[PDB]
């Protein structure tokens, strides 16, 4: 029971540590997508001027 509980805790840590790393990297990826939309509008406006 102690080994199963201790081993089960390792899987729980992976579901939070690895998930936090993916969430942190995913957050930066979404920020770049939003910046691309703003940069696209500047190209159409700058080209017209």
């Amino acid at each position: 029971e102690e080994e199963a509980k201790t081993h089960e805790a390792q899987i729980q840590e992976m579901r939070q540590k690895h998930s936090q790393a993916v969430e942190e990297l995913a957050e930066q990826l979404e920020q770049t997508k939003r910046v691309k939309a703003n940069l696209e509008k500047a190209k159409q406006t700058l080209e017209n001027e």
């Binding site: 089960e8 729980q12 579901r15 939070q16 998930s19």
Partner: protein
Amino acid sequence: AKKEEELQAALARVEEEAAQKNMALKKIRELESQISELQEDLESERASR
């Protein structure tokens, strides 16, 4: 001055709306984190049951 005055009001709305959006975005991330922790407790509680 009409368009300039109205432009300042429209720009201020974006800043005011951005402040509320920042709190809503932060609350969504905090609420999402609680859902992940609650889901782990449900799986752990269900598994223990």
